[PDB]
């Protein structure tokens, strides 16, 4: 679920998806395309990426089961489905933490038409 993924967002970042996440580069959200704004950006474009790979699982809906011992992400056990979504959020989750140090304001709510880039491959 987007909830629970928007979830690990602020407790590795310490931000919040929205808005920090929500629109970010050309990946952060409602899909996106192009080539990756940045390292931020190109966690964003994995997970886009990730999600694909599983064409038949509610991605942003199906609600699985996760921890957060010591800052480490868990993924219970659940369907190829819930297992599967749990394991792209967590590594986007810390792909974000990893990168804070570039965040880039300039980027938030950055426009979709200054994306004019041949769309990076998965």
Do not use: W
């Not at 679920?1 to 967002?9: A, G, R, S, T, Y």
């Not at 996106?32 to 699982?57: A, E, I, M, Q, S």
């Amino acid at each position: 679920n987007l909830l629970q993924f928007n979830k690990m967002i602020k407790e590795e970042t310490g931000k919040n998806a929205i808005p920090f996440y929500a629109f970010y580069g050309c990946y952060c959200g409602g899909g996106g395309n192009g080539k990756p704004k940045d390292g931020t950006d190109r966690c964003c474009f994995v997970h886009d990426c990730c999600y694909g790979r599983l064409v038949n699982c509610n991605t942003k809906s199906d609600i699985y089961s996760y921890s957060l011992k010591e800052g480490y992400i868990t993924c219970g056990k659940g369907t190829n489905c819930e297992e599967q979504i749990c394991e792209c959020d967590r590594v986007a989750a810390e792909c974000f933490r990893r990168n804070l140090d570039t965040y880039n304001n300039g980027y938030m709510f950055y426009r979709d038409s200054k994306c004019t880039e041949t769309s990076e491959e998965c």
